[PDB]
Structure 1
Amino acid sequence: KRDEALFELIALEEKRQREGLELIASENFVSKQVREAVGSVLTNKYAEGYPGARYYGGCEVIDRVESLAIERAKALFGAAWANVQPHSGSQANMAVYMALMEPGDTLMGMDLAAGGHLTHGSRVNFSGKLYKVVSYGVRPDTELIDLEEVRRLALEHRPKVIVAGASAYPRFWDFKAFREIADEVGAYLVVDMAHFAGLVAAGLHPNPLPYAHVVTSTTHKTLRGPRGGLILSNDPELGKRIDKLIFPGIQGGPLEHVIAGKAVAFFEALQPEFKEYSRLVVENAKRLAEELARRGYRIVTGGTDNHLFLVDLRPKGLTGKEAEERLDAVGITVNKNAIPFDPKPPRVTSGIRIGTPAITTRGFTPEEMPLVAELIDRALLEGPSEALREEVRRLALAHPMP
């Protein structure tokens, strides 16, 4: 018997995605071929271990699939080693921390309120539970990272691992300087490029590979692949230690169907069209932030160098939670986000985060940003309304989905 109830819900979700403007910076729309691989029979095989070194037999074809994903990842990012088995970005980070540190050691990452991710040292996350955390933020004036403040914190606290990269920082990272700082205290530099991995692949964002000891990432987000994790390094000796932490360290069997999807995603990222897409992603982000600033909205750091930006809603008397709800009411999805030196608690926040990778995949161009900017503005000032919801629907439907 077919589970009609469940499939009816899947159809409702397709409709929602098609009829709205998805502006959550961490989302995107995978291609049909990525889905074809993820929904393949590769899920019926237990492949504990690594290619050529599996626990069980019958992995001759799976080994070629995994190997292909590994080599393409290496080729795509210019890395000497890769591990494509992490179930997620969080497991990728977990593995790296456990390979380089012992519980109790000191970890240094970006403060959550300044843009850091939960896995960069939050007390409610494994990172802040097993390790002593020291965070760095951004300057109160420019809202940019001050490298001398980072240097100071490193010398004072002597972290074993320093993490660069974030989930809500809209400017470029100076990886060379972060490596110099880590070298000053004998720490490992770990770059979590999950958010900008696609831009790095397209050559539109500095590559951390040569400067970081280890690089982690998600395969979804700007890389536009399936949901999963990835770990890279220019040092294969360090890589061997990390492989051991992924399995048998923290995971059991890998999701080989997902890994097949990663291989397809890397193949897609290697095509010239991916660079054109990535360029448009950034152009859309700059133009959209610009149009919102023209309407009186304050953009953190005054703009963006990547695919995302933050809007400070304090001057407008709106909390991030309220903005998110008013936009969601009309089909525009974003997520409330804390801003630097946010006076309000994380459950409420004073701003919203916006990203363009998803709408750019749907074919939106910089010339359409002024229109998107107008819908956001009205939803926030005039609030939800049927006429507004319809205008959003029509705009969305005029753009296809992969």
Structure 2
Amino acid sequence: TQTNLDFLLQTDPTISGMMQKELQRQREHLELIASENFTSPAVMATQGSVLTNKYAEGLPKKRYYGGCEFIDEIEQVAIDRAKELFGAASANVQPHSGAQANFAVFLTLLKPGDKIMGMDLSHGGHLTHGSPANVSGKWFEAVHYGVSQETEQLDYDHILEVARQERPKLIICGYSAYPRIINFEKFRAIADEVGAYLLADIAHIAGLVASGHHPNPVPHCDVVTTTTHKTLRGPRGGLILTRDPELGKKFNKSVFPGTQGGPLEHVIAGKAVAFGEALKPEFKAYSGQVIANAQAMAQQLQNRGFKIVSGGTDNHLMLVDLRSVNLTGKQADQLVSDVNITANKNTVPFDPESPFVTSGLRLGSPAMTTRGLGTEDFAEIANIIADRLQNPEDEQVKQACVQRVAALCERFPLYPHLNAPVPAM
């Protein structure tokens, strides 16, 4: 009996072949981009389902259209599992992305021209928290706080002073390159002092929140946004949570009809699955291992003479300052790409280089942790990177790095049931 994949090979061999090549690419490199992960077979199965065919504008049991009996059930399972996982009174699982989740919150709380305050984009703030190239900075007045030049982490007394001076309507916490625990109770105290709304955008750390390895913002903030991918290891999509169920209804209307049309019900089924996985003990152990792995990589890089911004990490990621090897982030990113390692350049706090150049490399553990790597495997990764960056013109080092990458990939197969290679025998 024919599968959907059989149909794809028969009718579009070009796309079929390129998809096979992308699986092989995933298998044969070290994925160290801190926002990346490998979602489950079960999640992928939902995304490949007939749920793509249902229009389901509205909410479970309050749809514009009939025929949503089963979409409602699936969406309500997603909602209910999200509420369970994050201890939340309200969840909206329809946002197409983290950007769209944030946008729906802005549409609810703000009007164009209102002032928002988030982390400086060069200190780990997100594009959607006030970049001039994003709607958040183009149609709102974005101001910023950064980290302490001394500690390279947040100084809550300084944030309070900035907030008192700027008087934002919305304060945003949660970041894309911040390696330490965020104190949501201190953010609440600050927001209350200046009469601001408080959003925690926990996209990067949501799996750590879900597993109890990071404090949960939900009881403290007005609203919490996240992606369903990243550390939560779900399908690509967004999520809005809030402790306030009446406010939750307002966010609902801002998602639809405020921001979006019909939701992606196949992706929402994937969200339900991913939340279901995160409710299990295996995921809690996984999240523990993510942190341990990131800490092991950071420590070995320190042992190899690199500076880690803030001196280490409490989460899944780290920023490597590249002064010790006299390289820009851009150069370092290219050099590790050339040995089959994916990372990305990142400004360090108080970087003297442009954002186009940077002095940092951002690394994270989630993706390779999903493939089963342990702390000593991550110390090996640290050594491969240090070798490459310390000897960038040495071709024999380059090939040793290539070989050591290949050995790690061979030891930790990815999705081995899919397009399995021809047996050696």
Same fold by TM-score greater than 0.5: yes
Match of 1:351 among 360, 373, 388: 360
The alignment status of 1:382 with 2:391, answered yes or no, reads yes
Q: How far does residue 315 in structure 1 lie from its aligned partner after superposition? A: 3.0
- Determine the structure 1 residue equivalent to 2:197: 188
What amino acid does structure 2 have at the position aligned with 1:80?
A: A
Separation in 2, partners of 1:151, 1:386: 51
What amino acid does structure 1 have at the position aligned with 2:301?
A: L
- Determine the structure 2 residue equivalent to 1:131: 140
What amino acid does structure 1 have at the position aligned with 2:404?
A: E
Q: Deviations 1:22-74 (Å, cap 9, x if unpaired)? A: 00000000110000001100000111111111111111110000000000000
Match of 2:264 among 241, 244, 255: 255
Q: Deviations 1:284-330 (Å, cap 9, x if unpaired)? A: 01111000000000000000000000000123210101111110111
- Determine the structure 2 residue equivalent to 1:38: 47
Match of 2:76 among 67, 72, 77: 67
The alignment status of 1:47 with 2:56, answered yes or no, reads yes
What amino acid does structure 2 have at the position aligned with 1:254?
A: P
Separation in 2, partners of 1:333, 1:186: 42
Match of 2:379 among 370, 381, 386: 370
Separation in 2, partners of 1:25, 1:272: 23
5 Å matches for 1:2-401?
Answer: 2-383=11-392, 385-401=398-414
Runs of 5+ unmatched residues, structure 2: 1-9, 416-425
* 8 Å contact kept, 2:305–2:324: no
What amino acid does structure 2 have at the position aligned with 1:167?
A: S
Q: How far does residue 390 in structure 1 lie from its aligned partner after superposition? A: 2.4
Separation in 2, partners of 1:388, 1:168: 26
Runs of 5+ unmatched residues, structure 1: none
**Identity across matched positions, percent:** 59
RMSD: 0.9
Q: Secondary structure at the residue paired with 2:117?
A: strand
Q: Deviations 1:108-159 (Å, cap 9, x if unpaired)? A: 0000111111111111111001111110001111101111111111111111
Q: Deviations 1:171-192 (Å, cap 9, x if unpaired)? A: 0011101001100111111000
Separation in 2, partners of 1:400, 1:203: 28
Q: How far does residue 388 in structure 1 lie from its aligned partner after superposition? A: 2.6
Q: Deviations 1:256-285 (Å, cap 9, x if unpaired)? A: 000000000000000111011110000001
In the superposition, the TM-score normalised over structure 1's length comes to 0.99
In the superposition, the TM-score normalised over structure 2's length comes to 0.93
Separation in 1, partners of 2:192, 2:225: 19
CA gap 1:219/1:56 in 2 versus in 1, 3 angstroms: same
Separation in 2, partners of 1:374, 1:180: 42
Separation in 2, partners of 1:370, 1:240: 47
Separation in 1, partners of 2:247, 2:168: 19
Q: Secondary structure at the residue paired with 1:249?
A: coil
Q: Secondary structure at the residue paired with 1:166?
A: coil
Separation in 1, partners of 2:379, 2:261: 48
User: How many residue pairs align between the two structures?
Assistant: 402
What amino acid does structure 2 have at the position aligned with 1:386?
A: Q
Q: Secondary structure at the residue paired with 2:256?
A: helix
Q: Deviations 1:348-397 (Å, cap 9, x if unpaired)? A: 11110000000100000012222111111122122363343122112111
Q: Secondary structure at the residue paired with 2:318?
A: strand
